[PDB]
Amino acid sequence: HMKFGVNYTPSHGWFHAWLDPDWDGIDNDLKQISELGMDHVRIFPIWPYLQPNRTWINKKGVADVRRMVHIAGEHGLDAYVDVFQGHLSSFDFLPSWLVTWHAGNMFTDADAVAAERELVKTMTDELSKEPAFKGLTLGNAVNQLSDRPHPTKMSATDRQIDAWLDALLPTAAGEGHNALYSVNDGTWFIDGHPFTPVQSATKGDMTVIHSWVFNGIAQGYGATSEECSSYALYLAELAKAFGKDSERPVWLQEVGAPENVLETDYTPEFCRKTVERAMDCRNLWGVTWWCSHDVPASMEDFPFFEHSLGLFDEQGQLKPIGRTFGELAAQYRSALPAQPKTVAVVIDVDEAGNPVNRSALGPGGSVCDLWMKLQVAGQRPTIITSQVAANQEALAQRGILELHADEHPYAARYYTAVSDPSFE
Amino acid sequence: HMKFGVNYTPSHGWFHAWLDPDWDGIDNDLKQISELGMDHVRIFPIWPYLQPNRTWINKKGVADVRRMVHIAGEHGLDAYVDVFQGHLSSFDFLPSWLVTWHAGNMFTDADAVAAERELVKTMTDELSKEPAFKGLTLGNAVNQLSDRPHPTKMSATDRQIDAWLDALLPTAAGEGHNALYSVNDGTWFIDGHPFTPVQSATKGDMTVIHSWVFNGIAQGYGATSEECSSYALYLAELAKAFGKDSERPVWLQEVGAPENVLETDYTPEFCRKTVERAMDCRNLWGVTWWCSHDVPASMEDFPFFEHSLGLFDEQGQLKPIGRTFGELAAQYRSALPAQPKTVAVVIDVDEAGNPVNRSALGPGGSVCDLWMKLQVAGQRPTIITSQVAANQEALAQRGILELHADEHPYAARYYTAVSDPSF
Ligand SMILES: CC(=O)N[C@@H]1[C@@H](O)[C@H](O[C@@H]2O[C@H](CO)[C@@H](O)[C@H](O)[C@@H]2O)[C@@H](CO)O[C@H]1O
Ligand SMILES: CC(=O)N[C@@H]1[C@@H](O)[C@H](O[C@@H]2O[C@H](CO)[C@@H](O)[C@H](O)[C@@H]2O)[C@@H](CO)O[C@H]1O
Numbered sequence: 001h002m003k004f005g006v007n008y009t010p011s012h013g014w015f016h017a018w019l020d021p022d023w024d025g026i027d028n029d030l031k032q033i034s035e036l037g038m039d040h041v042r043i044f045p046i047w048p049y050l051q052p053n054r055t056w057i058n059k060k061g062v063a064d065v066r067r068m069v070h071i072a073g074e075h076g077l078d079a080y081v082d083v084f085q086g087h088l089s090s091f092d093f094l095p096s097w098l099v100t101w102h103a104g105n106m107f108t109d110a111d112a113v114a115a116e117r118e119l120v121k122t123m124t125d126e127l128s129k130e131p132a133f134k135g136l137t138l139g140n141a142v143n144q145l146s147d148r149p150h151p152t153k154m155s156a157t158d159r160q161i162d163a164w165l166d167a168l169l170p171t172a173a174g175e176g177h178n179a180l181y182s183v184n185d186g187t188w189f190i191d192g193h194p195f196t197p198v199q200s201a202t203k204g205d206m207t208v209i210h211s212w213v214f215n216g217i218a219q220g221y222g223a224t225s226e227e228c229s230s231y232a233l234y235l236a237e238l239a240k241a242f243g244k245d246s247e248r249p250v251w252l253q254e255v256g257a258p259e260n261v262l263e264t265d266y267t268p269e270f271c272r273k274t275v276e277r278a279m280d281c282r283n284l285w286g287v288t289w290w291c292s293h294d295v296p297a298s299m300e301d302f303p304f305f306e307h308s309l310g311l312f313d314e315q316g317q318l319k320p321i322g323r324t325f326g327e328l329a330a331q332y333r334s335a336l337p338a339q340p341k342t343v344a345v346v347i348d349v350d351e352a353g354n355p356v357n358r359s360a361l362g363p364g365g366s367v368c369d370l371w372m373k374l375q376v377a378g379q380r381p382t383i384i385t386s387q388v389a390a391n392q393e394a395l396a397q398r399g400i401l402e403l404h405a406d407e408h409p410y411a412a413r414y415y416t417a418v419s420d421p422s423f424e
Numbered sequence: 425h426m427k428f429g430v431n432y433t434p435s436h437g438w439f440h441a442w443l444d445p446d447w448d449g450i451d452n453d454l455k456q457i458s459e460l461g462m463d464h465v466r467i468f469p470i471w472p473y474l475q476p477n478r479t480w481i482n483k484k485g486v487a488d489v490r491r492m493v494h495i496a497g498e499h500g501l502d503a504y505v506d507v508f509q510g511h512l513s514s515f516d517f518l519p520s521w522l523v524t525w526h527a528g529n530m531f532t533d534a535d536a537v538a539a540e541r542e543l544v545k546t547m548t549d550e551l552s553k554e555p556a557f558k559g560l561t562l563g564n565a566v567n568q569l570s571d572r573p574h575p576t577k578m579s580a581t582d583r584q585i586d587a588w589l590d591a592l593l594p595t596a597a598g599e600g601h602n603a604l605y606s607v608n609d610g611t612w613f614i615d616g617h618p619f620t621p622v623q624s625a626t627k628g629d630m631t632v633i634h635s636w637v638f639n640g641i642a643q644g645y646g647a648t649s650e651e652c653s654s655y656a657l658y659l660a661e662l663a664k665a666f667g668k669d670s671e672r673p674v675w676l677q678e679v680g681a682p683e684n685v686l687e688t689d690y691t692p693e694f695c696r697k698t699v700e701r702a703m704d705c706r707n708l709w710g711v712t713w714w715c716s717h718d719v720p721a722s723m724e725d726f727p728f729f730e731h732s733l734g735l736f737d738e739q740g741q742l743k744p745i746g747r748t749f750g751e752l753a754a755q756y757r758s759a760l761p762a763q764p765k766t767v768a769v770v771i772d773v774d775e776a777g778n779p780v781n782r783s784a785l786g787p788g789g790s791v792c793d794l795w796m797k798l799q800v801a802g803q804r805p806t807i808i809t810s811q812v813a814a815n816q817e818a819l820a821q822r823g824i825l826e827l828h829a830d831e832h833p834y835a836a837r838y839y840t841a842v843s844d845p846s847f
């Protein structure tokens with residue numbers, strides 16, 4: 001069974017709805033989503049509304065998240081909840097006790113981590129009362145705060161991020177639901193980034209990826225190229241390469257058709273092709289489209305393409321990409337896992353198991369260029385580390401017959417870490 | 425008539441009460457405040473809850489502010505509402521469309537100002553439906569974002585601040601209420617600060633001051649000293665010295681008894697002496713104590729003394745300082761204005777009317793020391809600018825017979841601009 005769902009953006013009020021929720025409108029949103037054949041939603045509370053003080057949790061805010069989970073369960077949806085937003089569509093929502101006069105570091109400050117731990121525990125304890133609650137994500141792209149290009153970064157070493165993850169994820173655990181975190185693609189593509197590919201493929205219950213072709217994939221390879229619609233597949237094969245466990249599932253927790261780089265008329269086809277190719281990774285556990293509903297036009301300072309990432313429009317009308325994604329779910333939720341792959345691109349790793357050269361992995365880098373060349377020639381390449389490639393027994397076990405290495409590496413020609421040129 | 429009131433800190437949840445208002449608790453808070461003898465409260469909504477997107481105002485949040493004003497009026501309290509928080513008790517509440525990836529300047533960015541104007545208009549129009557709405561203050565100490573030592577300042581020139589005020593204050597105007605703004609004391613004590621004394625004494629309806637002796641007054645002169653308990657008076661005479669209307673009211677909009685520089689058991693006497701000396705200013709319109717209720721102990725990262733600034737404790741019982749303030753209100757709300765003064769300290773100003781040397785006005789500065797010395801000696805000194813001092817006719821009309829100039833100026837020796845050394 002392959003899971004299909006959406007990242008739920010409330011159609012009246014966006015995530016400002018938490019400040020004045022239109023519950024009848026939220027019910028209409030979730031009914032529509034369910035009637036499209038989705039089996040789950042991802043839900044995003046706002047951190048400074050849940051925890052306005054380091055030692056004071058907004059109990060009503062928690063109850064509002066529980067209510068939203070409950071409504072989704074009414075309509076047969078499983079609910080996954082991200083806690084630390086944090087970052088949403090280019091906006092940072094940070095509690096006042098971590099900014100300006102109270103500038104702190106949410107990854108390395110002992111009492112910040114303790115308060116985070118307490119909120120996760122409060123959230124897990126309360127949401128576990130809803131059968132529809134199926135997993136908790138530490139937060140949406142929590143890594144973006146930890147490094148440049150972020151203009152007020154909370155820097156950390158990878159060892160500190162190891163300790164941060166090890167301090168929060170066990171608190172999210174419990175029977176009946178998963179414990180996860182998410183990162184943006186800087187984890188695989190930015191050198192010296194403290195969130196690492198090994199962490200993503202070892203900590204938490206599944207390997208989580210967000211697939212966004214405005215990072216240079218559409219720009220350099222071509223919006224309609226096969227490379228661009230194979231990019232979610234490349235990310236899935238890339239992320240799972242760095243785990244101890246070759247069977248660890250991969251969750252494509254975010255994937256959208258951004259119209260700052262794709263043509264509007266092309267997005268249905270882009271969606272179909274991207275999903276189908278992503279499903280050629282046999283570790284793939286599910287696909288969660290970004291996003292459910294257009295961001296209200298009355299709201300400003302969004303990069304313009306964010307307003308039309310929806311499967312429904314602002315009036316609640318189903319868009320053509322929406323119809324396509326619902327057709328993908330009905331056809332493929334019952335499909336069999338993909339055949340294994342016998343051709344692998346090899347990535348050199350250090351002793352810890354992380355790429356020594358991360359810049360070569362991004363859009364227009366030597367490793368990406370190599371995988372794309374092989375993919376578009378029908379060689380169906382998977383990805384492995386140099387540690388696995390050196391193990392002749394593992395290779396024969398995994399069935400791999402042909403290895404391709406990055407013979408002369410180069411940095412990512414196309415890569416940009418931001419979604420809009422005005423953030424560069 | 426002299427006004428007595430409090431800055432309203434909700435006893436359950438503090439200003440985080442806005443996220444989940446316990447309306448029976450707020451009604452009871454305001455009832456206890458009314459029964460102590462206060463005639464007004466000052467209310468603090470949170471800006472990122474009212475306007476979480478530049479072009480999207482939370483109408484529920486607006487309505488919640490209206491309801492609080494309405495409850496205040498049902499207990500016979502006048503309500504004064506401050507909009508841009510902004511800053512509360514060492515915490516900044518900034519909307520996400522002004523920070524990090526969207527970092528902008530709330531003073532000089534055209535569309536931030538237009539959005540600020542839209543929120544002021546929205547607030548004014550809703551709150552004007554409530555008879556208890558007597559005043560809109562742009563925000564609590566809005567100058568603190570404009571300059572050092574703020575760690576992410578939105579810098580601005582004094583001309584740009586002139587334009588900011590002139591763009592916002594007409595929008596808050598309306599029949600039945602005042603339009604004002606508020607600043608911390610860096611306006612008078614920090615050279616080069618873009619909020620100026622002439623602005624405070626000319627823009628908006630009243631000269632607004634916040635009097636906090638942890639700025640070096642208590643440390644320098646001594647917590648129990650007469651100079652320390654004469655500080656609110658000094659500040660009121662100082663702030664009104666820079667307005668071209670000699671009759672413009674002065675609102676002592678915040679004054680508290682901070683236990684980081686005062687001993688707990690002294691705070692009632694500090695309260696009595698501070699208030700009694702401050703009423704020796706002829707222009708003083710009212711005193712508004714900080715604050716009604718202790719900050720709940722379960723909330724952390726406050727400077728420790730913030731917790732006990734209340735007139736009521738966390739159980740909602742009247743504190744000894746609260747008893748004193750209720751007794752000051754009952755004794756002095758009918759009192760007649762103070763006698764005029766004949767001894768003046770003269771401050772040299774530029775052609776715009778602003779102090780040449782602001783640093784000498786601060787605690788332990790040469791002008792502060794001069795005025796304290798005369799005040800301690802019994803000479804009831806007022807303060808005028810060199811422009812008034814150069815006109816022998818104006819002096820006689822004001823009945824000033826003796827002038828003291830600052831002949832050897834020096835910078836403020838005691839002044840600190842933050843409430844806590846941990847900043
Ligand atoms: C500041 C910036 O450029 N941030 C972007 C993120 O917004 C983006 O996050 C994902 O992408 C969608 C569509 O833009 C966005 O609405 C959500 O926040 C989502 O989580 C991310 C893409 O990997 O890239 C960052 O650079
Ligand atoms: C960062 C900092 O030190 N800020 C303080 C302000 O908090 C303070 O404002 C007033 O002080 C009381 C008690 O500290 C506080 O609860 C309110 O914010 C109030 O408005 C100001 C006093 O002049 O000093 C600043 O430095």
